Design a binder for these strands. Structure first.
Lengths: 302, 173, 246, 302
DNA sequence: AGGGACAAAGGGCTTTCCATTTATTTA
DNA sequence: TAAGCAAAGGGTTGACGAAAGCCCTTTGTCCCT
């Protein structure tokens, strides 16, 4: 008949990115790392809503948090650590016959191209979300277990094949397919131009004076760890009218566009599991989607 | 009132001003102490799996007996012996000590074993007095878990739970 | 000639906060006055009075809901009912850093009292709590109020507890004055006919109901009388204060 | 039809100006830039209010910030970079369907004229405003990919036609109509004379701490980057009774004059953009306004 | 001399009955 | 010292049930042939 997820089936994080930090460096010298800090400036713009055409002559004012490269340096440095953990399938919470029948039905996935797309997203620098634009050249350096690599140009929308991402893909694919962890200490260098604007992650502010407050650790501009871990997993290219590599979620849902790319057409992850536990043959490019959501996380309820 | 009181005695039929059901749902110990009952005091109510019949407005036996000393005008005895005797046939003593705290006290030259069981008035006057009159330091609890109607009918009626005071002193800087 | 022994900065962990169904947080004065009988029976040192402060205290949980661990399945009759989580009845716990003062008469050198309370701390539990770290006890001698003020100045910093008394009843007094109630005594209701389910099988057992009182949390550097802060056994099955009502 | 703009639709900046720093140079010695610092001077004024005239006999004292040229320098420098970054038609939030029919409705906008007017405000010097007055001769030097073009003082309002503006405008038109980005490192040079008072942007004080707080960056006087962005986009000469160029706004708002130039009479943004997506054809001046406001940014959602 | 009935005693599983405020709120 | 301090978009879901009733089985208690 049917096997169902346990009322409780929770899947812990198999990626642990640290919240990235934003530093200011020069281009020719990268050792004088000086914190880009969150400063609080004030804007005096316009009252311009789609509604309320009467209020179009009275200027609004709010205090926003801004972060720029200081006017002696022309490179933004983004420093983080990402821990790719193994023990992918073992259900943290939950875990009986919907964790083990998934193991006997999901041991033959493609971990290699999975790890290739994840290390490509770090290497092509899609982890910045706004600092790519207005940048002449990007240099992303990755250090794993006392070895260092440098990446100059990778067009991010099409996952090209090269030789300096592929061996890190072998390490990460070996560390998800078994036990353990692999630590990527990654530094992104962007020649944004002299004294340009950097874009940290905004925090939620619940009824505060600041209309725009950036993420802050010790007075200094920083980006959210879950924003980094969002941008590791923008690998999903197996949905209806496959196009952009969007972030992988059980409904294929980007909340900026307000449309879920895998929902309501029998393609979602949840659906793509009950057949797997029931024993149907999962194809080569959607069990990899299921495994990418295993290494994402989430709750798998009743 | 007569038909659902008759349903109550045909049911399990227990009323009580003191219980250990609030400490653990496996209690089944019930005593109606007599001398502590004053005009504004409140009483909870148990029958098996919290059953009952409404009074054609969704109104069960509890708020009936609880609403402003309704029970008093049958307990003092201005409503006749016909209702009062059938009311008195329900308040029985039921003893049980399992899964309850069992502590000691130093009496005169020796120790005494005694079981702490809870009070009926304190929970209901807590829900109706720390709430309505603006005391802004309390904890809100729900007993039991996802199915709270197993203990009593008081448990069954309000699902927001009772209120305790906070016992957190200010700390050294 | 009275003697004072002091347990300073004792880390209590796992202490269940449910003093009653209506007071939660600190355990009642019955707990800390029965600690004296616990060392009177287990060790043998006669304890006549007890006082307590709180260096730190926090009940485990959030701001309006403190709550309870997932229960075990430690009951017979739940053979197939073990795959599910638990039946969960509320039992909130706490953790705190406390100071304790015990009134003892020793008639012996003070180098034995410290070790004799030290080996009792390691085996007893503070209302289900676990002692993590505690300072070394020391013996204080006071014969008047002037030398009792030397006991007053050495508990700095702590927040001691003094009696305050009830005006008419509990929740009304908790509202208009904004004070704190806690259990100070127990009233006998009914005697259990059979003693085969007791833990002693000889002493008669009576059902009890908790009687409450109002208190006050006071800075230890600002209390006029320590005997206003000490607690002891009373009558009948109650506790009271040496110094009375503050 | 009736594609109602997404409940949350927002367009990011496609012009990224930097915080314009101010310096003090000489007209012949143009390389020794003395950094002008924001000083703090205290001011004993008088109450000048058009109500309750009896308070005028009693004075008042407020402490202000001031930015003055050093007496040995007779020219001020304004340093900023403006980064013209392309892909002006893809939104950041929202961005789906509504924006795609906008893309297929705006493939014929005159981006050359838009780039010409967007760089004309640099070619003159709208950025300066108050530093423009009292100047014997403005001289702006633009550096863009090894192509330094010196300008003098183009009359601000009327947009004249020449050759040196047109090359940089061709570069910007090649950027905004397609992919990529361009950078203009821009230096303004004006003979304000020995020691004359210069005018940075002014920040925001608390309840009562300073009367006028100038925008300082490590103690150096500096202009706001959104003030520079107001300067770049001051191109709008397409409202009814077009007298002077204003900033391109969704409502045509000039907050300093308190007049809504385009609100309430169909020439605001949300009417001719809804007409564009609904299938109504546009002229050559409203569609270039709608893409110019897409370069400006903002949120477009009710 | 021992399996078979007579019946108590545990034990798994099967409903069940709910309806108030959902708090606000920190020193 | 005086005049003006923005808009939408959402805010999770999963376990957390004692006692009466209904059958099923097992082993105290008693029986002759």
């Amino acid at each position: 008949t049917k096997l169902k997820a346990p009322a409780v089936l929770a899947y812990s994080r198999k990626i642990n990115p640290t919240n990235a930090l934003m530093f200011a460096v020069n281009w020719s010298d990268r050792d004088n790392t000086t914190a880009v800090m969150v400063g609080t400036k004030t804007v005096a713009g316009t009252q311009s809503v789609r509604g309320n055409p009467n209020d179009a002559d009275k200027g609004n004012i709010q205090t926003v948090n801004f972060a720029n490269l200081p006017h002696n340096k022309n490179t933004l440095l983004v420093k983080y650590n990402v821990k790719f953990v193994g023990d992918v399938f073992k259900a943290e919470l939950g875990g009986g016959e919907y964790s083990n029948t998934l193991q006997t039905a999901l041991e033959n996935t493609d971990f290699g191209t999975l790890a290739y797309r994840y290390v490509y997203n770090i290497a092509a620098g899609r982890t910045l979300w706004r600092n790519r634009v207005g940048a002449e050249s990007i240099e992303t350096v990755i250090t794993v277990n006392d070895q260092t690599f440098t990446f100059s140009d990778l067009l991010v929308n099409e996952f090209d094949e090269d030789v300096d991402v592929a061996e890190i893909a072998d390490m990460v694919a070996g560390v998800l397919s078994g036990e353990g962890f692999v630590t990527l200490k990654v530094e992104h260098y962007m020649l944004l131009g002299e004294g340009s604007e950097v874009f940290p992650s905004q925090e939620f502010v619940e009824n505060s004076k600041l209309s725009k407050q950036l993420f802050d650790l010790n007075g200094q501009a920083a980006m959210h760890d879950q924003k980094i871990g969002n941008a590791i997993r923008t690998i999903d290219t197996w949905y209806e009218d496959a196009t952009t590599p969007i972030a992988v979620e059980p409904y294929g849902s980007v909340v900026r566009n307000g449309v879920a790319y895998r929902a309501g057409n029998k393609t979602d992850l949840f659906t793509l599991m009950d057949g797997a536990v029931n024993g149907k043959s999962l194809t080569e490019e959607d069990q990899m989607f299921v495994t990418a959501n295993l290494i994402r996380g989430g709750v798998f309820g009743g | 009132i007569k038909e659902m009181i008759e349903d109550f005695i045909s049911k399990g039929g227990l009323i009580f001003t003191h219980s250990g059901r609030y400490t653990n749902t496996n209690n089944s110990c019930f005593i109606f102490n007599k001398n502590d009952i004053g005009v504004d005091t409140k009483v909870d109510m148990y029958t098996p799996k919290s059953a009952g019949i409404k009074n054609e407005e969704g109104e069960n036996l509890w708020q009936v007996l609880n609403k402003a000393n309704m029970f008093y005008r049958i307990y003092s005895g201005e409503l006749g012996e016909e209702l009062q005797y059938l009311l008195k046939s329900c308040c029985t003593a039921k003893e049980d000590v399992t899964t309850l705290p069992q502590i000691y006290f130093k009496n005169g030259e020796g120790y005494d074993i005694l079981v702490p069981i809870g009070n009926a008035h304190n929970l209901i006057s807590g829900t109706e007095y720390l709430w309505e009159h603006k005391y802004y330091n309390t904890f809100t609890q729900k007993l039991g878990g996802s199915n709270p109607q197993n203990c009593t009918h008081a448990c069954n009626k309000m699902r927001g739970g009772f209120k305790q005071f906070n016992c957190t002193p200010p700390q050294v800087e | 000639m009275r003697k004072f022994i002091i347990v300073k900065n004792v880390k209590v962990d796992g202490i269940n906060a449910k003093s009653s169904d209506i007071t939660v947080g600190m355990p009642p004065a019955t707990t800390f006055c029965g600690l004296g009988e616990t060392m009177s029976i287990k060790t043998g040192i006669v304890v006549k009075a007890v006082s307590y402060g709180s260096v730190k205290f926090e009940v485990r949980g959030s701001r309006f809901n403190t709550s309870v661990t997932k229960f075990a399945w430690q009951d017979r009759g739940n053979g197939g009912k073990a795959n599910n989580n638990s039946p969960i009845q509320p039992k909130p716990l706490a953790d705190g850093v406390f100071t304790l003062c015990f009134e003892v008469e020793w008639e012996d050198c003070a180098e034995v009292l410290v070790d004799k309370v030290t080996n009792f701390i390691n085996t007893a539990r503070i209302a289900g709590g676990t002692i993590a770290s505690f300072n070394k006890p020391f013996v204080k001698v006071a014969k008047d109020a002037e030398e009792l003020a030397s006991v007053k100045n050495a508990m700095m910093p702590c927040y001691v507890v003094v009696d305050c008394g009830v005006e008419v009843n509990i929740f009304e007094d908790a509202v208009n004055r904004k004070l704190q109630p806690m259990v100070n005594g127990y009233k006998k209701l009914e005697k259990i006919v059979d003693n085969k389910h007791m833990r002693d099988k000889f002493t008669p057992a009576y059902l009890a109901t908790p009687t409450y009182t109002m208190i006050g949390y006071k800075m230890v550097s600002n209390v006029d009388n320590f005997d206003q802060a000490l607690w002891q056994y009373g009558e009948n099955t109650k506790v009271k204060t040496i110094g009375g009502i503050y």
